[PDB]
């Protein structure tokens, strides 16, 4: 569980810890891992006298350095109960020539099904009886990882198309603030299609109240970086 | 005369730990109304004679 305290906009600040190398502090994450984040506005916010914190934070996720996937991912379709068949080599288009070592982790396999990595490319994907939803598995063509995304219809017309994951994301509605002792937490999840290296930069935004209802903003940034072994 | 209570209104309510918002609270009103009577006023009249 990381924990960072903000600083206090007091025109005095840079606490103890600090390793001076950039503006946004950082975070060290691994491609699978979903963790958890702390951050403590008690500095900021408790002499700004008011109703503390409120559940309006707002986040964004943008990308410091890409180097763009390899594989590229796929969606797949069927209806419930009946089993699906489907292709994994036209995901991997090559520069150069070599084989294709097709992998199906059993860490990031199915969670309602399962699948049978045949010889080449073909794979069969059996999902769960009395089962509909969407479901996926993580390949790993030759070590680039990508993500085959299933969805069962119910049998009855059709079901959407997820958005397909990102590498680093901040769940939906996972975060909570405790408006007594200014505490802000969420959770850091990071797809294990990251590839090692990458830097992807958080951006938080952060709003209090007074003690009538306006707004106190304060704005922070944070620089995630994806590397293996931890 | 008489009186009309209008409403009772709000008193400020289960605060945990002081925030100093909702102290006074809002009261209501009394609404002093009145109200008067009203009359008919008919008449008739015969004769004498068309009447003995």
Same mark, same amino acid.
């Given at each position: 569980?990381?924990?960072?305290?903000?600083?206090?906009?007091?025109?005095?600040?840079?606490?103890?810890?600090?390793?001076?190398?950039?503006?946004?502090?950082?975070?060290?994450?691994?491609?699978?891992?979903?963790?958890?984040?702390?951050?403590?506005?008690?500095?900021?916010?408790?002499?700004?006298?008011?109703?503390?914190?409120?559940?309006?934070?707002?986040?964004?996720?943008?990308?410091?350095?890409?180097?763009?996937?390899?594989?590229?991912?796929?969606?797949?379709?069927?209806?419930?109960?009946?089993?699906?068949?489907?292709?994994?080599?036209?995901?991997?288009?090559?520069?150069?020539?070599?084989?294709?070592?097709?992998?199906?982790?059993?860490?990031?396999?199915?969670?309602?099904?399962?699948?049978?990595?045949?010889?080449?490319?073909?794979?069969?994907?059996?999902?769960?009886?009395?089962?509909?939803?969407?479901?996926?598995?993580?390949?790993?063509?030759?070590?680039?990882?990508?993500?085959?995304?299933? #969805? @069962? %219809? !119910?049998? +009855?017309?059709? /079901?959407?198309?997820?958005?397909?994951?990102? *590498?680093?994301?901040? &769940?939906?509605?996972?975060? #909570? @603030? %405790? !408006?007594? +002792?200014?505490? /802000?937490?969420?959770?850091?999840?990071?797809? *294990?299609?990251?590839? &090692?290296?990458?830097?992807?930069?958080?951006?938080?935004?952060?709003?209090?109240?007074?003690?009538?209802?306006?707004?106190?903003?304060?704005?922070?940034?944070?620089?995630?970086?994806?590397?293996?072994?931890? | 005369?008489?009186?009309?209570?209008?409403?009772?209104?709000?008193?400020?309510?289960?605060?945990?730990?002081?925030?100093?918002?909702?102290?006074?609270?809002?009261?209501?009103?009394?609404?002093?109304?009145?109200?008067?009577?009203?009359?008919?006023?008919?008449?008739?009249?015969?004769?004498?004679?068309?009447?003995?």
């Amino acid at each position: 569980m990381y924990f960072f305290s903000v600083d206090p906009r007091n025109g005095a600040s840079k606490s103890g810890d600090v390793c001076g190398s950039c503006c946004c502090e950082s975070i060290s994450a691994r491609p699978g891992e979903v963790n958890g984040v702390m951050v403590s506005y008690a500095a900021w916010s408790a002499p700004l006298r008011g109703h503390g914190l409120t559940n309006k934070t707002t986040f964004e996720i943008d990308g410091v350095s890409v180097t763009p996937p390899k594989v590229s991912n796929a969606f797949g379709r069927t209806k419930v109960g009946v089993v699906f068949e489907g292709t994994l080599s036209d995901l991997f288009p090559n520069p150069e020539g070599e084989q294709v070592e097709y992998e199906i982790s059993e860490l990031n396999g199915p969670s309602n099904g399962v699948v049978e990595l045949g010889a080449n490319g073909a794979f069969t994907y059996t999902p769960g009886a009395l089962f509909t939803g969407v479901d996926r598995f993580w390949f790993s063509i030759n070590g680039n990882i990508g993500e085959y995304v299933i #969805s @069962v %219809d !119910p049998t +009855t017309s059709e /079901l959407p198309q997820p958005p397909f994951t990102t *590498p680093v994301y901040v &769940p939906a509605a996972r975060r #909570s @603030v %405790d !408006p007594r +002792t200014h505490v /802000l937490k969420f959770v850091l999840g990071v797809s *294990p299609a990251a590839i &090692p290296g990458d830097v992807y930069r958080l951006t938080v935004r952060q709003v209090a109240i007074d003690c009538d209802g306006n707004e106190f903003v304060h704005i922070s940034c944070y620089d995630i970086s994806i590397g293996s072994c931890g | 005369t008489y009186m009309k209570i209008a409403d009772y209104g709000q008193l400020g309510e289960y605060t945990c730990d002081a925030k100093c918002d909702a102290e006074f609270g809002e009261p209501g009103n009394i609404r002093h109304l009145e109200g008067k009577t009203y009359d008919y006023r008919g008449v008739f009249c015969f004769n004498r004679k068309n009447l003995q």
